């Protein structure tokens, strides 16, 4: 009852847990296709969400396979390992010392969960697509937030799967906010809410106060949430602060999943997407207007509310942008 010596070199890894740059695709690749699974277990016992929350462990598993495997392996960005990913930053977030004992045990939860599920049973093409295709999930959702409502859905019914059921020792209150929050958070991921999320995020950072000399202070639900709800989309929008040799695997593969995409719009005569053409796109060009319009002003924002801890991340961010401008 020791570990294999895969199951060792993956531990290893795993102690990088807490850090912005973990290898997460070197641990899908020393998980067996299993990052979300593994790093889900590590944070959900570092934190000991599994005692708080009474969560019996060969559930939590059960239900981490079950979530991990309806992500599509066959879609080259919204996959497992972008879901793993979204939840390891998140939590490093959460880490963050301006937000040092901040948030309850429950709202922490929530922050992870959310980050999870987040992109859950992604098709890799669009909500625009999707809408313009008459598809089926367009339809259910009536074309509001196609993805984001489908993945909050297909996280929360597989809860449901035999010995899936990772809340069945949570209070219906707990329940209650829990999914409350959990849906605030995943439905602030559909990029048509980013100016909004922004917006909001700059005026809390402008009237921003502090207690205790360095912390913030939440006092309702309302900025409790649009923290939480910006802290997960930056996460989600996180690649471009990554180590250029993390960032570049995520470029390809969203470019592969947009290029897909592209193949299909003119597979079916569609009209094609901004930057979703090959032998037709500047790669480099789209992603320092990326950087420029979406990624720099949002973790600007978020390095502001929380400064000085983004500093590093800010710089990172800048360096990459730098790099891909020399093309
Ligand atoms: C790592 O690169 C990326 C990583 C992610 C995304 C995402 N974009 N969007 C929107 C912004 C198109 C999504 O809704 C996706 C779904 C959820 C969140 C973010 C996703 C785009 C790129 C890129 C790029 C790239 O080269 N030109 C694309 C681009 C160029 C100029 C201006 C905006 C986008
Ligand atoms: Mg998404
Ligand atoms: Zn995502």
């Given at each position: ?168 020792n949570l209070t219906k209150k707990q329940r209650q906010s829990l999914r409350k929050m959990v849906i605030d958070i995943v439905l602030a ?139």
């Amino acid at each position: 009852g020791v570990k294999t010596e895969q199951e060792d070199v993956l531990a290893k890894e795993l102690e990088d847990v807490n850090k912005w740059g973990l290898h997460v695709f070197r641990i899908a690749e020393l998980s067996g296709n299993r990052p979300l699974t593994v790093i889900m277990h590590t944070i959900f016992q570092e934190r000991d969400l599994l005692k708080t929350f009474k969560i019996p462990v060969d559930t939590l598993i059960t239900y981490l396979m079950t979530l991990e495997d309806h992500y599509h392996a066959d879609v080259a960005y919204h996959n497992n390992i972008h879901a793993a990913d979204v939840v390891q930053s998140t939590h490093v977030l959460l880490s963050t010392p301006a937000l040092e004992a901040v948030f309850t045990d429950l709202e922490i939860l929530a922050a992870i969960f959310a980050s999870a599920i987040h992109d859950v049973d992604h098709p890799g093409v669009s909500n625009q697509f999707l809408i313009n295709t008459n598809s089926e999930l367009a339809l259910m959702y009536n074309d509001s937030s196609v993805l984001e409502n489908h993945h909050l859905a297909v996280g929360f019914k597989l809860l449901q799967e035999e010995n899936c059921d990772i809340f069945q020792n949570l209070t219906k209150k707990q329940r209650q906010s829990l999914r409350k929050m959990v849906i605030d958070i995943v439905l602030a991921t559909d990029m048509s809410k980013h100016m909004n999320l922004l917006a909001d995020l700059k005026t809390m950072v402008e009237t921003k106060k502090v207690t205790s000399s360095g912390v913030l202070l939440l006092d309702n639900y309302s900025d409790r949430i649009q923290v939480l709800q910006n802290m997960v989309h930056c996460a989600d929008l996180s690649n471009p602060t990554k180590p250029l040799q993390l960032y570049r695997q995520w470029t390809d593969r969203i470019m592969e999943e947009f290029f897909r995409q592209g193949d299909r719009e003119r597979e079916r005569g569609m009209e094609i997407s901004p930057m979703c053409d090959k032998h037709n796109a500047s790669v480099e060009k789209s992603q320092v207007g990326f950087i420029d319009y979406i990624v720099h002003p949002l973790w600007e924002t978020w390095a502001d509310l929380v400064h000085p801890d983004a500093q590093d991340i800010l710089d990172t961010l800048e360096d990459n942008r730098e790099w891909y401008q020399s093309t």
